[PDB]
């Protein structure tokens, strides 16, 4: 829940989080973004 409610005005997303959780894990769990 804490992660779900973050925004640019309060938090910054590290590049490694973006990489992992938007490419690697989603592809490994058989869920693909639009």
């Amino acid at each position: 829940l804490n992660v779900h409610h973050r925004s640019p005005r309060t938090h910054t997303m590290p590049t490694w989080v973006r990489r992992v959780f938007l490419d690697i894990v989603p592809r490994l769990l058989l869920m693909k973004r639009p």
Partner: peptide, 5 residues
């Protein structure tokens, strides 16, 4: 704080 804007 980001404070981007």
């Amino acid at each position: 704080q980001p404070r981007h804007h």
